[PDB]
Each structure stands twice: as structure tokens, then as C-alpha cells.
Design an enzyme around this catalytic site. Sequence first.
Site, PDB file in Angstrom:
ATOM      1  N   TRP A   1       0.811  -1.220   0.000  1.00  0.00           N
ATOM      2  CA  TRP A   1       0.000   0.000   0.000  1.00  0.00           C
ATOM      3  C   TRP A   1       0.846   1.274   0.000  1.00  0.00           C
ATOM      4  CZ3 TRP A   1      -2.053   3.047   4.581  1.00  0.00           C
ATOM      5  CH2 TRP A   1      -1.166   2.999   5.674  1.00  0.00           C
ATOM      6  N   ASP A   2       2.165   1.156   0.198  1.00  0.00           N
ATOM      7  CA  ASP A   2       3.157   2.230   0.090  1.00  0.00           C
ATOM      8  C   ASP A   2       2.998   3.042  -1.190  1.00  0.00           C
ATOM      9  OD1 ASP A   2       4.337   0.330   2.060  1.00  0.00           O
ATOM     10  OD2 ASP A   2       6.141   1.553   1.873  1.00  0.00           O
TER      11      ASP A   2
ATOM     12  N   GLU B   1       0.067  -2.041  12.760  1.00  0.00           N
ATOM     13  CA  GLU B   1       0.358  -3.471  12.693  1.00  0.00           C
ATOM     14  C   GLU B   1       0.426  -4.138  14.063  1.00  0.00           C
ATOM     15  OE1 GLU B   1       3.910  -3.867  10.176  1.00  0.00           O
ATOM     16  OE2 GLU B   1       2.506  -3.796   8.474  1.00  0.00           O
TER      17      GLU B   1
ATOM     18  N   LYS C   1       1.885   1.392  16.300  1.00  0.00           N
ATOM     19  CA  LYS C   1       3.130   1.450  15.545  1.00  0.00           C
ATOM     20  C   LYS C   1       3.250   2.761  14.774  1.00  0.00           C
ATOM     21  CE  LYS C   1       5.918  -1.277  12.287  1.00  0.00           C
ATOM     22  NZ  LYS C   1       5.887  -2.500  11.453  1.00  0.00           N
ATOM     23  N   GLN C   2       2.122   3.293  14.294  1.00  0.00           N
ATOM     24  CA  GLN C   2       2.086   4.384  13.323  1.00  0.00           C
ATOM     25  C   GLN C   2       0.659   4.923  13.255  1.00  0.00           C
ATOM     26  OE1 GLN C   2       2.954   1.041  10.561  1.00  0.00           O
ATOM     27  NE2 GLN C   2       2.086   2.432   9.026  1.00  0.00           N
TER      28      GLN C   2
END
Length: 775
Positions: free
Chosen positions: A339-340, A477, A597-598
Site C-alpha cells: 500500500w506504500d 500493525e 506502531k504508526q
Amino acid sequence: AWRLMYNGLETEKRAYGQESLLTLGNGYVGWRGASVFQSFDEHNYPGLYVAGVFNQTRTEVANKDVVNEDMVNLPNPQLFKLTLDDQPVVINHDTITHREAGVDFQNGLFTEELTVAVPQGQLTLRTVKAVDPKQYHMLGIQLAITADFSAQLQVESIIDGTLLNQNVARYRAFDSREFNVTEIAGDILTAKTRSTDIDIVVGAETTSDVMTFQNVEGPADMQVSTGEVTLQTNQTVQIDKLIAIGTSYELSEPLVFVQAALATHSVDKVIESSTAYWQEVWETADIQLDSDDPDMQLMIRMNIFHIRQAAQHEANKDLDASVGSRGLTGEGYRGHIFWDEIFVVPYYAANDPETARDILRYRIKRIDAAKKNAILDGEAGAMFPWQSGMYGDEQSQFIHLNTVNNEWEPDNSRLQRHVSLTIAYNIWVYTQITGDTSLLREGGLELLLETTKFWLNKAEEDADGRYHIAGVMGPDEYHEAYPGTEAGGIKDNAYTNLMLTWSLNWLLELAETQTEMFESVAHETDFGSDWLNLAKNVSKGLALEISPEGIIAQYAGYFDLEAVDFAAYEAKYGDIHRIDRLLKAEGLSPDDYQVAKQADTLMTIYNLGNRHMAKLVAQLGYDLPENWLALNKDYYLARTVHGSTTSRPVFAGIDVTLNNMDEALDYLTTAIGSDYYDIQGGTTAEGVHIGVMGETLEVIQNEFGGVMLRDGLVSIAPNLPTSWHRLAFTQKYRGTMLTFEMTPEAVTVMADAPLDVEVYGQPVSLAANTAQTFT
């Protein structure tokens, strides 16, 4: 300003990391900035990768076959071996007395200059590498050799077909041989991947004004050309090596192609083509920033350079490929597509739109593979995989070997189903910015309708009319399951439900604005009035959980998870950006804790902005307090450890909206320097981080710079830090070029065609080539 330069030798992963950042590429190849005199060892890793060229291996691990799909490291065509009076020239950290290496972004040329101590004295070795962006199958090497003595020099110029995939240390446990060499004939080495049936052809010609090279019998699986010259004291010898690369993935006759290519090009033409290409690129692609940070201008251009080496239309028009998380710079995550893409497709759409179109073709070609993927998991429609490669089937692992107890557990990584909404989103951004609705017609709309079938079939309606999406993970994640169950996935991830709401809105808008294409594609995909009515209902009834204080729960039940004492973990272990592994080492499960995580809930703001996100929440029938953005940013920042390179830039953009300029600039500066500074050591050893590169340009241009293009009009509302004295760049919007110049107190905008825009929310009519300034 324009050159990425390194002085002195580096070791181990720090050396690998420099090679990654010194990679050259042209959309078709990526070619690591390793020294031409070295092979894979502890301080060197030559790497040459071709878009879309993968091989599958099988490795037995604990009575189970692990199949991996690896981006192939091609036979190494740059290897040079030197001999002085029949004594090998040893070139390593014990004999190199000076080393500098760099890439000039202005012309795309890599240079390396070495000084080497040899018995007779001193050897100066200067290398130029270049890739041709037009004749994109061609590479070039220029080698200048000078000695302060006289001796017989033999030069061996090699294509080394004996290598393996060895870039990533933790992958070396697996079978790493990706091809068999099938023939070496004259200038040309032919190989074939072991399981994917791809013929790889690597040919070269080595020439010089003062010596002749001849093909000779080399070691097994090595093509060798050798020549001999009498070195005269302080008199430079110049050698050119022209390289041609072709495979049966993109060519019907790669052997003939490479033979003809070697006969019709030269290293000088490669260098001049690279030079002219980049000089053209920089006339519109430069992003100029005069700030108080002396490194930031270089890092901006290094981002633009690597993103444009990862894909560029003159090559990718002929290719079936997208941009992996490390481009073509290394083997980190095996060159798979993630998905980057969401971090580079908007950049290409706004600046190089035909390249965006090429990359989106990769997913449209794999719609059928995504429908197979859905069926294999008991779903409907098109379910795009978390990790994509050659065939478009899922390339994440389904099971994982537990290191503590030697037994196989489920791997839940593929349950980040939101990747399908990233793909729809990227096609939306492309369409909005370019106006090219031919991509919708040629598969893009089919992709939206089939992925919508997947989400709509997965939605579960409850007694009260709310729809739920369960069994999924969001971008954070760390949360793969609810506490106390081994069933994977959680329910009503806010990011997933909000992006799904956005995509349903877009579907319903296309049914009205593109009626004939919609009815045609709806007929072919069986998207009948029953599916369309379900879309309308779901677009109004998807569930969120909002606290009385106005916090959007990351997913249903998140507020019942336990708190983490972050300061305690920071004191005990130092760095907590891998706190999930710290918790697991202690026998604890990240699933049980409020730790991220983000960006997850806040990822929605990166994608759509806070106003659009607020409209979606309101559309679902929820009430947010007016200051919901600060409240939610504060809440989740207090729980986020930035385990991903893409975490900090999301917060930075929100901080611009919140007028938290210092923390916005700090977060951007930290993120944009992650590859470059390499404080932790070896961070980019396995490849550059392409995502953070595009994401930090987003913070510069779309947040600080305040330029947005995706919402149906050009919207301009810069908010510059006081230390950003001048920011300048261009954008392309539906064929019209815009130029921007901002200072902390004003913005000047010019369009080369008439255009109705908004500046700080106010309607403005731009006349062709007539700038206006707003203060």
C-alpha cells in the site's frame, strides 16, 4: 545542494546503506552504488534489479516448505579485477587509502574515486556509472586508471552469474539461488529464473582507446573479457563498459535484443542521455527551499531523484510494474508491492502524470488475481493482497514459525484488507488531478466496483441498522487480534470504515457524473441495483465508536485495552520504536495494550484531510466536538512509538493544521533525514525507504505549502514556518502548469492557462501566465 557525497570508507550495514542511497535507476533497472571492484562481502553488495522480475524459491524449515517470491539480483555486470605484473591488485579496507563516492542529481551520474596502495606504489581508480533513461535497457561504466609507476596491467571485465540474493541478512536462511546460467557466448550471459520461466540476458562490451579486450573462457557461470596495457607513470588509461539488459518478462526475444543493443550504443551516449534527461526534469521538478537547515535542500532533491528513478514513463510505458517499498534499490521485503504506493502515486499524478498511469496499470492488470484471492479466503469481489508481486496472488506468509516454541502459528499480516481502499484511492487521486478518465474506462472503474463488492459482501448489519467490518487490521500493525482469541483481525477499524465510506461516496458520484461508463461497467461486473442499494445503505450506516470526550476509537473495544508505561520501557530498553518485540520478549501481547506502531485513525487525515474526514463521520451520523482534531492527535500521539518511517510525517501534517509549527518542522526534519543521517546505523542497508520520501514531499508541498489538488479544484493555503524564507515548486493540474512561490507572509501563484482556484478558501480566477500574490 545537488550532490550526495560520501568521504572515507564505511563498514558493514553502514556501507550497504550508502550503496542503497547511491543507487541509479530508470524505471526499468535499479543498480546499487557498490564499487565495481567488489563482490558481496561484509562491506559491499552489488545489486542489479529489473522491474517485475521475480523468482520463487522453496526452503524446508521445520518439516514445512516455505515458498518465497524474491526480486532477483541479476548477474553482476560491473565487476572489474585488476592485475599488476601478474599479481592480483588487492582492493579492500586494508589497501584503500582514500575513498569518495557520490551521485550528482543534476545529471544522474555516480562517481567513485579510490586511491589504492600496491607494492609498486599508488593506484588511482575513478569510476563513472550511468543509466540511460531513454534507451532504458542500457547502462554505462567509465573507468580511469592511473599509476605513479610503470607496470603491465591486465584488466578482467566480468559478468558474474555466480551470485545469490544475499542483501538481507535475515533472508539468508532461505534458498538464495534465483536463476541458472544457461549459456555464455561472446559478449552475452543468459540465465533463466528457476521457477518463473524468465530468461535473463546480460551482455556487455568493454573498450578503450589504448587497449583491446577479448572474450575469454572464465570460471563457471562467469562471462569474462580481458585486456592488457602497459601503464606509463602518471598517464591515465580510460576504459568504457557498455551494458545491455533484457528479459523475457518484457521482451519477446531478449537475446536478439541485447545483441543488437550492444552493437548500437555507447557509454558516451548513455552519459549524455542521462545528463539531458535530468536537466530537463529539473526545469519543473525542483522543489526549492531556503531554510535555516543546511542539509534540507539536498534531502528534498534526493527524495525527488529516487522517486523518479523508481518509475518514469519513458521506461514504464512498456512495463508491467509498480513501485515497491524500496523501489529497485535493494532486497528489503523482496521487492514486493505494498500500500506504500499511496505515498508516491499522488506525487506522480501532480508532477509526472503518465508515470502514475503506468503504475496504476499494475493493479488493474491484477484485478482477476484479486478476485481469485477473495475466493480463496471465502470472500467475494476483488480482494487485493497485502504483498503483491508477479502474479497478484497473496505473497505474505500465511503461517509463522514461533522462535520460542518450535511450532507454526498463524500469520495475520494479510488481514490489512485496507490495501484495496488504497488502490481505489490512488485511482481517484489520479483521476481528480489529471482529468484522464480513460483509466477508469480501461479497468479503473471495474476495480472500484469489484473491490466494493468485496467490502459490501463483508459488511454485517446489526439489529439497529449499523454495518460492521470485522476480521481486519488497520495500518497499526501492532493489533492483530482481540485479547484472548487466536482468531485474526479486529472489528470496525475506524480508518478502514472511513475510507470505505469515502469510496462508496465516490462510486455513487461516478454513477451520476460518468453514467454511460458506469452502466457499461456495472453490466459487465454484475453490479446491479441490489449491489447499488447496498452501497447507499452501507455509506450511511458503517459503525464508529466515539468516546464522550470526542476520541474516535481505533477499532471497536480499543478503549478497554490496557495502558503502557512508555517512559518505563524507554528507561529500561532505551529505544521503544520496536516496543511490540520488547513486549513479546517479556511474554506480553501488544494486542492487549493501547500502543500504536504508526498512524491508523489519523491516516485518514493524511489521505483526505480533516475537513473531508469530518464530513464522513457526520455522514455516518456521529457528532464530533469542534476541536476533535487536536483531541485525537494528542490522544494517539501519546500512544504511538513510530515503529514505521511513515509515522512521523502524518503527525507533522496535522501539526501544521493545528499551527504547531515547531513540532511539525521537527517531525518532518527527523523523517526526511532517516535514510541520510543513518544514526541508528544501516537503516537503508536493504534499500532506500521510498514511502517516507514521497510522504515528506507531501508535508512540504501539501501541508506546509498548503497546495491541494484532489478535491475538485486547486486549493492554496500555505502555512510556512518562520525559518522557511522561500519555498518554490510547480504542479500539473489537468494539463495546466502552476508555479508557486511562498514566503512566511505571502504566496504567488501563476497558471499557464485560465483556472478558477481557491486561495485561503476564497474564489480566485487565474488568467494565463498572469501571476497573483496573496499575503
